[model samples]
Target: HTLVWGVWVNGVDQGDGRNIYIRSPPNNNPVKNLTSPDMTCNVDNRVVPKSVPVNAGDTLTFEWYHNTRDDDIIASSHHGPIAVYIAPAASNGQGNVWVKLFEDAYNVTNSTWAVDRLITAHGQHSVVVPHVAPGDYLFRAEIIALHEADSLYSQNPIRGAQFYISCAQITINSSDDSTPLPAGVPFPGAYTDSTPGIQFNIYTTPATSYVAPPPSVWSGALGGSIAQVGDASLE
Candidate 1:
């Protein structure tokens, strides 16, 4: 289910089929929590050779697959939030620093925090680019699957959550748009098991509310209103 078979820039399919996805890891990187702490470019090592050019507000989509068969793509079974981020090209290493533009958490029933339903946009998902100074960037998408997160790894050291990550190079055209670029968090620093939403135990607890981790989604200068929410940007 870890196969990302295609990628879309703006609305155009980057490939007709099978070729755009980065070569995946040998196996799922399960967490003793967010999995690999030294994660740089998601363990895929090779950044696809072309940068998908986009404007500040363009949409980027990801397509996942479960198998080589056209009928076996998997999208919804992992239950947790998905976040999109980007790092400045000036940054030296991979997955090192990033600004959070989009993060969707579980928002369904009988649950305490918003850790409820997985994003239902099965087989694929999309996130928007926020306004920022025109420049080059490393776009990243990550998903933290929490179904088995509650296991006591202090005893066995073998289990926790699954952190899925992917990246692409992008060029944002320079412009005069006013959307403020959000301050970002480096990957190793972006998530910690103690963060409210990262290490949540879906099997046992039920809470009424949640406080998703820091470099929290940029709630704009105004508020949840037009003044509050912000989108993705060049970090």
Candidate 2:
């Protein structure tokens, strides 16, 4: 289990409990139930009073740790993929508004995974903010651990992919881009117990490639329609 203890925009740390929803008691336990509302964000989350002001193409770095920021990021056995999504804050993170901005799964050539890279980077994973009509938005970052995902939640409640999730409130200032965003996907509806990426047997199966569940990855291109509704969608 791992928790995002800190969020950094570009090189600036947002400080403790400032713009992100961090769980109390600071446990790294993951959300195993795919249908639970916790799938959208981690459990026991509350709105933070402030939103980090960022540009449209700024880099957002998500930092995770087992306990403190100095500890080992997570157990070595916990291997999986990393994903980032963006949505309008006013939408309340409902429906299919979460646009998948980035994803990194397994690479057959290097025989490495996204989780391994995170550990190598000392638990700092970054993704560039897409150029879109800007306003208040929620950036959702997640890492899916597949160490015990071979067994489905239906078989045993504890046996499934572990979703380590965190959400940050941000306001994109002066995007100025006229391009609209794309149609996004819902979290609870996007993954299932038997989804190829969720139910993988990493220890035994000889997998040549991997797909990190979906909505699929967005290449930062403005698509047909803007996914974000309410005030966030200015186009």
Candidate 3:
């Protein structure tokens, strides 16, 4: 089965020195014990599983948050909704050789193939795209800060804060014959409830009939069936 991973950031918790929340995407309901107790801003690292098995044409959905309530006023022009980045795992190790899988400008339009930048108080954002081949991948976030007219904070304004991409990974694979579905049956779709994580759906294409491995083989990584919680409230 395919899997997912997610992370949540909170300004209040960061300012007050509390732990952040990193967990799997929620399914029909919220997950329990997903919170990273006593987490700090410095510990804001997140990553997906190393690999997942699925047939092509399946969808992968990534959802997350970028806390702005505290940094908004201080960095007026630095209005970040949030910025996301995706790149091949191989390119990331080169320090500067990675290609841009996706990037979203804060307060700008969205891109599904790459990233999703949504604007909401204590913003919660999600993006769904077609799943690709089995390979190593990375995901990252940038906290944006706008400049002010007076140039008070603009001179040394906080343009953005980028989290490490190596924290997350994505892998894709096909199923085997042991666990076979009935002919003409489509692969089940994956989903997330209140938590942020990955889920997989596997089905054979008319052209290539490949059976996927069992979920047990594709289990165990950073996030499984868990959801994280933090201070994110809509305005």
Which candidate ranks first by TM-score, i.e. highest?
2
Give the runs in model 1 whose Cα sits over 4 Å from its true position.
Answer: 16-38, 69-72, 75-77, 92-96, 109-120, 152-155, 180-183, 207-210, 219-235
Off by over 4 Å in 3: 1-59, 65-78, 90-93, 106-123, 128-132, 147-167, 174-235
2 versus 3: better lDDT goes to: 2
Task: Give the root-mean-square deviation of each candidate in angstroms.
Answer: 6.7, 7.6, 18.0
The candidate with the higher lDDT, 1 or 3, is: 1
lDDT for each residue of candidate 1 in 175-232, tens digit (9 for 90 to 100):
4547655556766655665666655676676533444556666542111100101111
lDDT of 3 by residue, 77-130 (tens): 222223233334554322332222223332222321111223222233322222
- Any residue pairs clashing in model 2, and if so which? none
- Encode model 2's per-residue lDDT on 2-109: one tens digit a residue: 877666676576666433443322466888898988888777555667777888667767777776663578887888888888888887677888998877788687
After TM-score superposition, the amount by which residue 112's alpha carbon in candidate 3 deviates from its true location, in angstroms, is 18
RMSD of 3: 18.0
Q: Model 1 lDDT vs. the true structure?
A: 0.54
